[PDB]
Amino acid sequence: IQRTPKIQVYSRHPAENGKSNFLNCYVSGFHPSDIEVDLLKNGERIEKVEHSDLSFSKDWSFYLLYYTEFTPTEKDEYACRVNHVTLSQPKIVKWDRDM
Amino acid sequence: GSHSMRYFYTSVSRPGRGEPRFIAVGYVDDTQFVRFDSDAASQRMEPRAPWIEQEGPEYWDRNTRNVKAQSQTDRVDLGTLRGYYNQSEAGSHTIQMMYGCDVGSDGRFLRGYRQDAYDGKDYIALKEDLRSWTAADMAAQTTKHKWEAAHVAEQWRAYLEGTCVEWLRRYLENGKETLQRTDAPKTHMTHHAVSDHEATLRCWALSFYPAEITLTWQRDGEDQTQDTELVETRPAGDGTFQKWVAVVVPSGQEQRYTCHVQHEGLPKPL
């Protein structure tokens, strides 16, 4: 079966501009496990992004957390860019600090 | 409270070159404590929680040997199942398996389970009696005949009711300072205007352990689900979890709405 990823982009801690924090991209509900996830600052790809060890939910659909240290600011835009067999183009989801 | 130990295995065939990717992770309740990844350097089962570190060299040898033999069994089985479903050698496929055991508050075995999947769908599962198999289709039925002939369920039952339960109790005493501690959700509500007369109230549950939680809105003491949005519980990335639920409310009428939080770390939540 194929299943499209769900995506949540969010900081680990309450975001405060100027304070160091971690940007997370949680992709879940997807099948197969191969997927490409990039964290983006002002459209460019962040370089040392890390992710958890692949695991899955009760319905056998996978999840991964991608994360990197970051500092929220007033003008930088952060996002998560996800590509998967079920997507005709990459999905970009912009980080909103209220969610 | 009750506790569980679970191992999750995933093998993905790589038709263009090499062998399958194999990744194994083990959990005690919602705490990952070991991993193996065939693409990593160690080619060893690796510690992922401070309290497993103390385990001696044979622990790590035996666990490495075990999860390596499983990756090779999965390699063979990707071939076999490819044959069963009559699929070509060109495409990539996946076997996943989850197994484990739960214990109650006194540490006695409560239940065991071992089920697997082929390309994200149920393939063959051990029933709760830990004596028989549920085959989802005719390829798993072939597997189920071989395993009834070889009495494979017996071995699983002996592991799930013995070894699985013995080591989970060991782990629970050893990592007790985090494993037997609940981190009740730290909660607050935010208000976001959506216009000059509507607003979203968002109820935040943060930094909690275990992951299981229920977040719900009431309006004047009765549960509301209209105009609400509930996100999937997500990892904070530090071992704890996060969740929020939001409702759109007429501005000025926010005191009618209460968010109700239910979590193990809470004595009689509401």
Domain with residue B262: its CATH number is 2.60.40.10
Q: Tell me, what DSSP letter sits at residue B40?
A: S
Query: What are the backbone dihedrals phi and psi of residue A26, each rounded to the nearest 5 degrees, phi first?
Result: -100, 110
Q: How far apart are CA B124 and CA B127, in angstroms?
A: 10
In angstroms, the separation between the Cα of residue B121 and the nearest Cα of chain A is 7
Residues B77, B81, B84, B89, CA torsion sign: negative
Q: What angle do CA B139, B144, B145 make, to 5 degrees?
A: 100
Q: How far apart are alpha carbons B44 and B75 in whole angstroms? A: 18
Q: With contacts defined as CB-CB under 8 Å, which chain B residues touch A12?
A: 236-238
Query: Could A34 and B12 be called an inter-chain contact, meaning their C-beta atoms sit closer than 8 Å?
Result: yes
User: Rounded to 5 degrees, what are φ and ψ at B111?
Assistant: -160, 155
Burial class for A58, CB neighbours closer than 10 Å (0-12, 13-18, 19+) = exposed
Q: Are residues B98 and B207 in the same domain?
A: no
1-60 in A: which are within 8 Å (CB) of B? Answer: 1-3, 6, 8, 10, 12, 22, 24, 26, 28, 31-34, 52-56, 59-60
Q: How far apart are CA B44 and CA B73, in angstroms?
A: 17
B243, β-bridge pairs: B205
Examine the domain organization and report whether B154 and B90 are in the same domain.
Answer: yes
Segments forming the whole domain that contains residue B192: 182-270
Domain boundary among B154, B181, B208: B181
Domain match, B159 and B229 both? no
CATH code of the domain in which B101 resides: 3.30.500.10
Last residue of a domain, one of B158, B181, B204: B181
For residues B163 and B238, give the distance between their C-alpha atoms in angstroms, rounded to a whole number: 29
DSSP state of B239: S
DSSP one-letter string for A50-66: EEPPPEE-TTS-EEEEE
Return the H-helix or E-strand segment holding B90.
none
Same domain, B131 and B216: no
Q: Are B169 and B263 found together in one domain? A: no
Which residues, listed in sequence order, are joined to residue B266 by a DSSP beta bridge?
A: none
Cα A63 to Cα B25: distance, rounded to the nearest angstrom? 13
> What is the set of domains in chain A, with CATH numbers?
1-99 (2.60.40.10)
Of B129, B151, B181, the one marking the end of a domain is: B181
Question: How many domains is chain B built from?
Answer: 2
| B112 and B42 both lie in a single domain | yes
DSSP letter (8 states) at residue B161? I
Alpha-carbon dihedral angle through residues B216, B221, B226, B232, given to the nearest 10 degrees: 0
Distance CA A23, CA B236 (A): 10
R_g over Cα of chain B:
23
Does residue B206 share a domain with residue B170? no
User: What does the alpha-carbon distance between residue B130 and residue B67 come to, in Å, rounded to a whole number?
Assistant: 22
Pairwise CB contact (< 8 Å): A98 & B192:
yes
Whether residue B187 sits in one domain with residue B157: no
This structure was determined by: X-ray
Tokens of B54: 């103390």
Spell out the residues 6+ positions from residue B107 whose beta carbon is closer than 8 angstroms to its own. B165, B169, B172
- Cα–Cα distance for residue pair B87/A46, rounded to 1 Å: 39
Same domain, B22 and B145: yes
Tokens for B145?
Answer: 């005949």
Among B94, B212, B233, most A C-beta atoms within 10 A, so best to mutate, is B94
